[PDB]
Amino acid sequence: NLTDRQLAEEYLYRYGYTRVAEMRGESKSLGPALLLLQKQLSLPETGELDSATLKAMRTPRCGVPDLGRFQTFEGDLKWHHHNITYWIQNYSEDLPRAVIDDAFARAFALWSAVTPLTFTRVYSRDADIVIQFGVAEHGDGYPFDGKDGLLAHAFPPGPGIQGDAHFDDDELWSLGKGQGYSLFLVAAHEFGHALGLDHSSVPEALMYPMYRFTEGPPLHKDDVNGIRHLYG
Numbered sequence: 001n002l003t004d005r006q007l008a009e010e011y012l013y014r015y016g017y018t019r020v021a022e023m024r025g026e027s028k029s030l031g032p033a034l035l036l037l038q039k040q041l042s043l044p045e046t047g048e049l050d051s052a053t054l055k056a057m058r059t060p061r062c063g064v065p066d067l068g069r070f071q072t073f074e075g076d077l078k079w080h081h082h083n084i085t086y087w088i089q090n091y092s093e094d095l096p097r098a099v100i101d102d103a104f105a106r107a108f109a110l111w112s113a114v115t116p117l118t119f120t121r122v123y124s125r126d127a128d129i130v131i132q133f134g135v136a137e138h139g140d141g142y143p144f145d146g147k148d149g150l151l152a153h154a155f156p157p158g159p160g161i162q163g164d165a166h167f168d169d170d171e172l173w174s175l176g177k178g179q180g181y182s183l184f185l186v187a188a189h190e191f192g193h194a195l196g197l198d199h200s201s202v203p204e205a206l207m208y209p210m211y212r213f214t215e216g217p218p219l220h221k222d223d224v225n226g227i228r229h230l231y232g
């Protein structure tokens with residue numbers, strides 16, 4: 001029961017819009033930050049807390065920031081070897097273990113066709129991409145928010161926590177039918193970040209930050225070109 005205005009202030013802060021408005025001398029009213037968000041999400045650029053902007057802010061999405069408050073990390077944020085390993089550290093009880101394993105394998109198979117990298121499952125803490133399910137504060141100081149709102153987050157390529165992918169288990173994980181969010185579609189978006197991709201402004205793109213259920217092929221031209229500009 002946040003008000004529409006309280007939701008707007010929280011959204012603009014969480015995803016980096018308020019910090020950018022501060023750097024431009026324009027954080028004492030909502031309008032300038034709203035214009036930065038409408039440009040970034042490809043909404044009409046009104047500067048108002050209008051119906052299209054409120055509908056966007058209420059839409060479940062990725063927990064990675066858009067414009068600001070990104071942490072300082074080690075290295076140039078791409079992988080420098082070909083065989084990327086992953087470890088499924090724990091399981092949601094919402095799906096059978098073999099269905100969770102296959103959702104992650106399918107999400108990696110989407111990227112493998114369009115990148116010179118391979119993805120291989122291991123059972124070891126020193127995998128490149130460690131996958132975890134967690135609730136609220138889950139060990140990295142970037143807490144989840146309970147049911148709906150942000151669904152998951154991931155870290156850009158590098159050592160340790162870098163490249164890792166976390167899924168909010170206060171969500172109901174499914175394949176996106178009946179109830180719950182598609183673990184396949186969320187994992188596919190989060191693995192893009194774990195390969196070094198940013199958010200897209202193209203609403204149809206996999207790397208757009210909002211969750212959109214589809215039964216169609218998830219990759220768009222903007223996603224494939226994004227990976228091409230990283231690894232060839």
Ligand SMILES: CC(C)(O)c1ccc2cc(C(=O)N3CCCc4cnc(N)c(F)c4C3)[nH]c2c1
Pocket residue numbers: 063064065069070071072077142153154155156157193196197198199
């Ligand atoms: C586009 C690029 C540069 O490859 C890239 C891609 C994805 C990420 C994810 C982060 C990152 O900063 N975090 C990892 C995601 C969790 C998180 C959430 N809120 C923050 N304010 C925050 F700093 C972090 C830390 N930083 C990133 C940077």
Ligand SMILES: O=P([O-])(O)O
Pocket residue numbers: 049050051052
């Ligand atoms: O905010 P509205 O007037 O576009 O509904």
Ligand SMILES: [Ca+2]
Pocket residue numbers: 127128129130158159160161162163164
């Ligand atoms: Ca890692």
Ligand SMILES: [Ca+2]
Pocket residue numbers: 144145146147148149150151168170171
């Ligand atoms: Ca959540």
Ligand SMILES: [Ca+2]
Pocket residue numbers: 092094168169170171172173
């Ligand atoms: Ca759950």
Ligand SMILES: [Zn+2]
Pocket residue numbers: 062063064189190193199209
């Ligand atoms: Zn994202």
Ligand SMILES: [Zn+2]
Pocket residue numbers: 138140142153166
């Ligand atoms: Zn986390």
